[PDB]
From a paper:
Excessive replication of Saccharomyces cerevisiae Ty1 retrotransposons is regulated by Copy Number Control, a process requiring the p22/p18 protein produced from a sub-genomic transcript initiated within Ty1 GAG. To minimize genomic damage, p22/p18 interrupts virus-like particle function by interaction with Gag. Thus, p22 is identical to the C-terminal half of Gag-p49 and is processed at the C-terminus by PR to generate a mature protein p18, that is identical to the C-terminal half of mature capsid Gag-p4525,27. The structure comprises an all α-helical domain related to that observed in the CA-CTD of the yeast Ty3 retrotransposon, ARC proteins, and orthoretroviruses.
Numbering used by the authors:
A (entry chain B), B (entry chain A): 261 to 350
Write the structure that this text describes.
């Protein structure tokens, strides 16, 4: 699309997960956004990506933004493993 | 800051200009964000940058998002010249 990157960035900034949507969808949703943006030359690295994902991660997931401070060099895949683990216990 | 790029991206996505702030401040504000983001490896090119600026450009500036369709390959500087010109007439 002509307005591809801009809409991906706004979607990334307005992520709001609480536990309703399956992690499956939410993961591949964010995985795509970062892939598409990176295909178009906009590289959102793991550090910055995780930050934006954990932002707006509310509910019983809220806290993951607090341990993040100890989690340096955390990967997006790792971060979702955590989210997946939470969803399985619901 | 450790959370620099992420906060720059969210600032860019949540821009809301209507005519209150001087164009001077709003311009260099966005000019910096795009420079900082580009220094850190997040390449926001003119096309996508302008798109994100015109998004949330409300008030008497709204119409610049409509003329944009004729303005292909427009630069961020050009886009602000328009915003500056409108601000001068207020």
């Amino acid at each position: 699309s002509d307005t591809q990157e801009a809409n991906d960035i706004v979607t990334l900034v307005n992520l709001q997960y609480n536990g309703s949507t399956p992690a499956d969808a939410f993961e591949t949703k964010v995985t795509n956004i970062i892939d598409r943006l990176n295909n178009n030359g906009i590289h959102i690295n793991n550090k910055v990506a995780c930050q934006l994902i954990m932002r707006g991660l509310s509910g019983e997931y809220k806290f993951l933004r607090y341990t993040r401070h100890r989690h340096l060099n955390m990967t997006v895949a790792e971060l979702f493993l955590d989210i997946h683990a939470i969803y399985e216990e619901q």
